[PDB]
Amino acid sequence: ENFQKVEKIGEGTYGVVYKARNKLTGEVVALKKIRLPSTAIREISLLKELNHPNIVKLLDVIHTENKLYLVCEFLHQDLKKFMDASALTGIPLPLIKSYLFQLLQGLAFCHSHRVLHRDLKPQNLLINTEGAIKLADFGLARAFGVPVRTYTHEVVTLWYRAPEILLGAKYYSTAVDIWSLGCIFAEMVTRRALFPGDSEIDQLFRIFRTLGTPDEVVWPGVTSMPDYKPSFPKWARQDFSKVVPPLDEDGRSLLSQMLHYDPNKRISAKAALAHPFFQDVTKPVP
Ligand SMILES: *CCC(=O)N1CCN(CC)c2ccccc21
Secondary structure, three states: OOOOEEEEEOOOOOOEEEEHHHHHOOEEEEEEEEOOOOOHHHHHHHHHHHOOOEEOOEEEEEEEEEEEEEEEOOOHHHEEHHHOOOOOOOOOHHHHHHHHHHHHHHHHHHOOOOOOOOOHHHHHEEEEEOEEEEEEEOOOHHOOOOEEEOOOOOEEEOOOOHHHHHHHOOOOOOOHHHHHHHHHHHHHHOOOOOOOOOOOHHOOOOOOOHHOOOOHHHOOHHOOOOOOOOOOOOOOOHHHHHHHOOOHHHHHHHHHHHOOOOOOOOOOOOHHOOOHHOOOOOOOOO
């Protein structure tokens, strides 16, 4: 009886989200319920301290009756819905730039605390009516693993997955989130997913057909990754001018750096924020 359900507002990889009202404070919140060694409660509890204007505020973590509840600030819409609703005309470039600038600040903060997301996608980027955008679900992928199917048996999207993950690397760096964010960036600009794979191999070959099949020159160590096969077809790289029109030259330079194959060479969030693409960044209200 601590929270009143108002309405169901969404479904993530692990559980359902309701808008709720805090009985005793009157505050409106988003309450995620997840069913069911395990360091998940410790690690997720630590995210209550990892506060930033571009990270969804984690108000509380409740473990009771073999369910995990996450109490978050209420935000009104995800980026996937906003992109679908903006399909006819597209999100305006100054708003795209504002959103990427803010998302990079959120990543830079978590990354500075050694915390990775590992599963960024438009569905977990939430916006308000004031012009802010925030990252949701930090910590959940690491705590629980990324399953093939969600709790409601939907396919977990591969579209934003970094190539080192797809090639079976055992160690993920903060670069995995930069890759994902660069995919989201291209999708806002073109109104179409950059790499819409429908299996792990289809995802990898879509990446290869655009960026070129990687070799030891662009990506040292690539031919010794666990899931690398010498039989991969060898596609030549496309020019970014084709990939994301009509992004200007600064956006294209930034995007190419977010999409470097080698996780060691891929631009950091901190470095991306200093990119000349942001020289004229503003905060428009949609
Ligand atoms: C704690 C609530 C939560 O995890 N999130 C991320 C998932 N969703 C549903 C899209 C959400 C919406 C509004 C506010 C927070 C959250």
